Design a protein around this ligand. Structure first.
Ligand SMILES: N[C@@H](CCC(=O)N[C@@H](CSSC[C@H](NC(=O)CC[C@H](N)C(=O)O)C(=O)NCC(=O)O)C(=O)NCC(=O)O)C(=O)O
Ligand SMILES: N[C@@H](CCC(=O)N[C@@H](CSSC[C@H](NC(=O)CC[C@H](N)C(=O)O)C(=O)NCC(=O)O)C(=O)NCC(=O)O)C(=O)O
Lengths: 261, 270
């Protein structure tokens, strides 16, 4: 039996793979100057579900003839703690990738949260979200949905299934049930629509594919697709395959992250 | 006649997971590994431009606060009908509610001010929708807007750790489990520290002006540090040690539209 204290103080507690990285405090841990290249967009990121959203988006824009959507891509190693460097924290004080700088204009604009970066780029160039209120709203319903759902998938299911030191039954069941509910939701939606927000591929599809599409394609945690009965979600699976064959998606996944040190 | 979207105005990990009747505490009857409608339900639709199907939770109060801030700012067209969706009763799985929000979470909003109604779900998206509709509580310049959105999306991506992680394991799980509690308490504290440090530098989360991002953040973190959420949690988290966050939380709690949003009455649907 573990005793719950009145006031929590276990700063040194085991956090699995991210022991040392995870802390009860935020902010800068060391001085860091990040490189800045010539392209309008500087992307400080890593090839994770959240990072690939942004390279995919940029490649989709490039593939549609938006010539300004070129970017410099730099590797932020989250296991090394690069996300706690002074320059990175300036861009994203939450110390998570992806983080972006738009230096197309007079002064650079810092953008973080992967879904927000997708929205920012979509509105800047008028691509991959409808310009009519009804269509825009439905994309946003699902884009925000993804932002609020993925934490359970990655931070709940993924953590306990793959990165916690012991396999803990109760958390795994709790978070697996939620992951399945989410998969079932998306499957049932995609049984009625070509893409998540209707007839047209959108930033919501990019956001959702990067987590749920890769998941059911068995590209994420080892054994997870099988554990979750991924193949049983036929409409989600068919949509994930369709999106995986887009050239911009393939280029987004294959993008080269340059060293910062 | 209800909502009409068409009409005019040591444990062994198995190889494949199998569900169970596993006791999740309070929400065991309700939670399932599938989504969708569970029964037929016609929701009331009133006369006001905004129909809000919700409950007085951290996610729900964001929207009543927003609507009341808009009204307090002179937006006479931001009146609403407010209806109680009981999440313990499973009202969120009724046919009309699922038609507005297939994810079956409150809050969900119908904007029937235009020619056809527009369903809006996700509390943060509802805030953004209302802010853009009326041009208030988000800046119109790109830099100002982007900073608000950074924090609005942040809130949406962070609250699951606070409610679904910390809240659940601290308050709702039948047993107090050490590893989950330490994981999610540490993350909650990181979030509180992050916010405290921002609010030491700025009057509101995105700068000198109050925004939808403050509403979204306050509704969780503000209420949390004011000891209004799970019993013992503010003490457990050392909430009073976050002095800039706590002062900001008090400041916003004193706003008249915030009080009115908290006090709103949720009408019965059945
Ligand atoms: N909502 C943000 C999430 C960004 C994010 O999670 N970034 C991760 C890498 S993506 S890789 C997937 C990621 N895992 C992690 O971040 C692992 C570390 C974490 N501290 C932990 O203990 O779980 C995850 O589950 N995310 C949940 C979600 O998407 O909402 C990161 O930089 N981590 C650095 C750190 O934590 O120090 C967004 O969409 O931009
Ligand atoms: N991202 C959505 C979340 C909305 C939401 O979570 N709504 C809750 C009530 S807010 S009350 C706070 C809420 N808790 C719950 O939803 C409790 C029920 C849940 N199934 C469980 O067992 O954990 C929570 O932790 N939220 C996490 C977050 O905000 O990201 C709901 O309708 N639940 C019905 C259901 O689950 O069937 C939003 O911002 O609108």
């Amino acid at each position: 039996t573990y005793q719950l204290p009145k006031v929590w103080s276990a700063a040194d507690s085991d956090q699995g793979k991210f022991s040392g990285i995870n802390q009860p405090t935020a902010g800068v841990r060391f001085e860091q100057k990040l490189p800045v290249g010539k392209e309008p967009f500087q992307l400080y990121s890593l090839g994770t579900p959240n990072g690939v959203k942004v390279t995919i988006m940029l490649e989709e824009l490039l593939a549609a003839g938006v010539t300004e959507a070129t970017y410099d891509l730099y590797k932020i190693s989250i296991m090394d703690g690069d996300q706690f460097g002074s320059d990175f924290v300036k861009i994203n004080p939450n110390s998570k990738i992806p983080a972006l700088l738009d230096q197309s204009g007079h002064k650079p604009i810092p953008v973080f949260e992967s879904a927000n970066i997708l929205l920012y780029l979509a509105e800047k160039f008028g691509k991959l979200i409808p310009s009519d209120l009804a269509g825009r709203t439905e994309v946003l319903n699902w884009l925000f949905w993804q932002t609020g759902a993925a934490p359970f998938l990655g931070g709940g299911f993924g953590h306990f299934f793959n990165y916690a030191p012991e396999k803990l039954e109760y958390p795994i069941n709790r978070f697996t049930m939620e992951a399945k509910r989410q998969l079932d939701l998306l499957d049932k939606e995609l049984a009625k629509k070509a893409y998540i927000a209707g007839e047209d591929y959108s930033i919501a599809d990019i956001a959702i594919w990067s987590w749920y599409g890769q998941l059911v394609q068995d590209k994420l945690y080892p054994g997870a697709a099988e554990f979750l009965d991924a193949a049983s979600y036929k409409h989600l699976s068919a949509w994930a395959e369709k999106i995986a064959a887009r050239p911009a998606v393939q280029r987004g996944l294959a993008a080269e992250y340059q060293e910062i040190k």
